[PDB]
Design a protein around this ligand. Structure first.
Ligand SMILES: C=C1/C(=C\C=C(/CCCCCC)c2cccc(CCCCCC(C)(C)O)c2)C[C@@H](O)C[C@@H]1O
Ligand SMILES: C=C1/C(=C\C=C(/CCCCCC)c2cccc(CCCCCC(C)(C)O)c2)C[C@@H](O)C[C@@H]1O
Lengths: 236, 9, 236, 9
């Protein structure tokens, strides 16, 4: 690993630590969980909160701030749910097959999201994705690189500078390939698995967009969302 | 995208 | 009081009981109070919740449902904050000079709204209004009639059928005048005081709209509002 | 006013 590759890793890890709270102490400020669509208010606040964190993380990705505000938004909107899916793996547990975020109130199973407007058609591959990603047992350096690579994908709707973004992602994919080779024993096949995860996220992204569209078209449900959520997942 | 633009400084 | 005047009173009282919970048990579902603009999330959820209740109340006001959807919206948008001000008097206490809504968490003083984006320029006449209105010691029949009269004011922006709405309000003002004369001892001067309260609400409405506009123009603050709140107090 | 219209049935 070169010095530049090292600086990139350092800054990305620091960016994640500054935008991911391991105590989940902010969750008490969300609309509380209720166990129709009783879980939608809590989920909406959680997702809205997470979007703000993803934005914070993205702004510290090297090269992202130099992009056009339009490109930044285009990348953010299209990849938001994928980054949320990726970052949520940190709270996911193989023992409980659930997201454990501090207290008993914030221990989320698959049934909770069902009570929030989404179906098993999304949640079944989601949990399967979470299990597979957890089994990869990523270093924090790798998990953090994966989120940055995902966010800087040039193949998103609305992007204008495809070459400048593909270059940034390549430079990031380079770092990831090098790190695994030098710092991760028995990771000879790990990189290919991680790229496959990015492909999994596209299908999950697609299914979420369909189910979100179903949800956002009903005013009684869309009124439970936050302005930020409506703006990020909206078609405007 | 007024919120996003604000959050992106 | 005639039978028709009596039926109107009955239906309005029942409408209020169905849309005003004396236990305030729903308040636990709001984003919790935090004691900048730390109180804005709780206030936003409280106001949003109250708007839904005001809508429920309005739909049961005799003649309101027969109005145009546009007129219903025009009346609702322009008078929403005034009805909220009126209905909040039920939780207001002269002992504490505050709104007491169940537990210690939901005991709101003037400083709480200050921590929610509004200034003393609105809150000082508001509390003064609350004190004066409480001192009138309205019967439930009167307090309920006042909200209905306020809501059916023809002198609002965006209204189209001024004659049909003024007629409904007149018919309501008739009921109020009769009720006070027949059912309220020493209320010889009460009706004039209540009409003066409607005039007070206009000034309070005006000041709120200015301070809301200041708040809604800042995305970091407007993102803390609810879709319903944005829609009702919005200029669209 | 899609929310208001919905809430007004
Ligand atoms: C959001 C996070 C966490 C869990 C995430 C999770 C797991 C679920 C936790 C909360 C369950 C109520 C999740 C992840 C991806 C997709 C989904 C499905 C919902 C998609 C967005 C909803 C909407 C905008 C209405 O379409 C849930 C919890 C922590 O790991 C922080 C992380 O940022
Ligand atoms: C809303 C209600 C209650 C209290 C109301 C209150 C008293 C305050 C209670 C909550 C304090 C945090 C109040 C009333 C009128 C105006 C204001 C000022 C805020 C205006 C709307 C805010 C915004 C849309 C952001 O501009 C507060 C409590 C109960 O009486 C139910 C009633 O419906």
């Amino acid at each position: 690993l070169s010095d530049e590759q090292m600086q990139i890793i350092n800054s990305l890890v620091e960016a994640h630590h500054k935008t991911y709270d391991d105590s989940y102490s902010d969750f008490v400020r969300f609309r509380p969980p209720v166990r129709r669509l009783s879980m939608l208010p809590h989920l909406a606040d959680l997702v809205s909160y997470s979007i703000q964190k993803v934005i914070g993380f993205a702004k510290m990705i090297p090269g992202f701030r130099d992009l056009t505000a339009e490109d930044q938004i285009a990348l953010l909107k299209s990849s938001a749910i994928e980054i949320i899916m990726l970052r949520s793996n940190q709270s996911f547990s193989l023992e409980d097959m659930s997201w454990s975020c501090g207290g008993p109130d914030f221990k989320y199973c698959i049934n909770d999201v069902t009570k929030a407007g989404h179906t098993l058609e999304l949640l079944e591959p989601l949990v399967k994705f979470q299990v597979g990603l957890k089994k990869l047992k990523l270093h924090e350096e790798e998990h953090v690189l994966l989120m940055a690579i995902c966010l800087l994908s040039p193949d998103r709707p609305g992007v204008q500078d495809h070459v400048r973004i593909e270059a940034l992602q390549d430079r990031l994919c380079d770092v990831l390939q090098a790190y695994i080779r030098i710092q991760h024993p028995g990771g000879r096949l790990l990189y290919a698995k991680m790229i496959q995860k990015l492909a999994d996220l596209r299908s999950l992204n697609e299914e979420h967009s369909k189910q979100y569209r179903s949800l956002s078209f009903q005013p009684e449900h869309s009124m439970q969302l936050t302005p930020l959520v409506l703006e990020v997942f909206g078609s405007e | 995208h007024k919120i996003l633009h604000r959050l992106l400084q």
